[PDB]
């Protein structure tokens, strides 16, 4: 319905992915790297929601995104996030990327 919105969502999601990768390498990350990830993620969530304003694929994406976001908020309370936590995060995050891309096919 909005191509510009779709692409904005896309570009932001790519930046979320790049930062998370960077962070995945490092054993502790500056509060500045962490916060860019988080603020980027908030804009992905917001643009996606704006897009709602296959239905079953959208529903699965949205549900998945929600769980990744909530997972991430737990991680914000931690100075240090174990690779155990970081694994559940990446796993789930991969599913969000996949389903959103599966939508591109159309």
Is residue 60 at the binding interface for ligand MH0, with CB under 6 A as the rule?
Answer: no
Quick check: 37 and 82 in contact, CB under 8 A?
no
Residue from 15, 67, 69, 88 touching ligand MH0 (CB under 6 A): that is 69
Residue from 4, 60, 81, 84 touching ligand MH0 (CB under 6 A): that is 81
- Smallest gap, in angstroms, from Cβ of residue 24 to ligand MH0? 5
Among 57, 73, 44, 53, which residue's Cα sits nearest to residue 2? 53
**CA–centroid distance for 63 within its chain:** 12
Is residue 65 at the binding interface for ligand MH0, with CB under 6 A as the rule?
Answer: yes
- Smallest gap, in angstroms, from Cβ of residue 105 to ligand MH0? 10
Two structure tokens written together for 102: 């599966």
One DSSP character per residue, 42-96 reads HHHHHHHHHHT--HHHHHHHHHHHHHHHHHHHHHHT-SS--HHHHHHHHHHHHHH
Residue from 15, 17, 36, 88 touching ligand MH0 (CB under 6 A): that is 17
Is residue 13 at the binding interface for ligand MH0, with CB under 6 A as the rule?
Answer: yes
- Smallest gap, in angstroms, from Cβ of residue 31 to ligand MH0? 7
């Amino acid at each position: 319905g909005s191509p510009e919105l779709r692409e904005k969502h896309r570009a932001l999601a790519e930046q979320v992915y790049a930062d998370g990768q960077e962070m995945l390498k490092n054993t502790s990350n500056s509060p500045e790297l962490r916060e860019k990830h988080r603020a980027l993620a908030e804009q992905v969530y917001a643009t996606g929601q704006e897009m709602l304003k296959s239905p079953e694929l959208r529903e699965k994406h949205r549900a998945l995104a929600e769980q990744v976001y909530a997972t991430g908020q737990e991680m914000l309370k931690n100075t240090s996030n174990s690779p155990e936590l970081r694994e559940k995060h990446r796993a789930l995050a991969e599913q969000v990327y996949a389903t959103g891309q599966e939508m591109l096919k159309n």
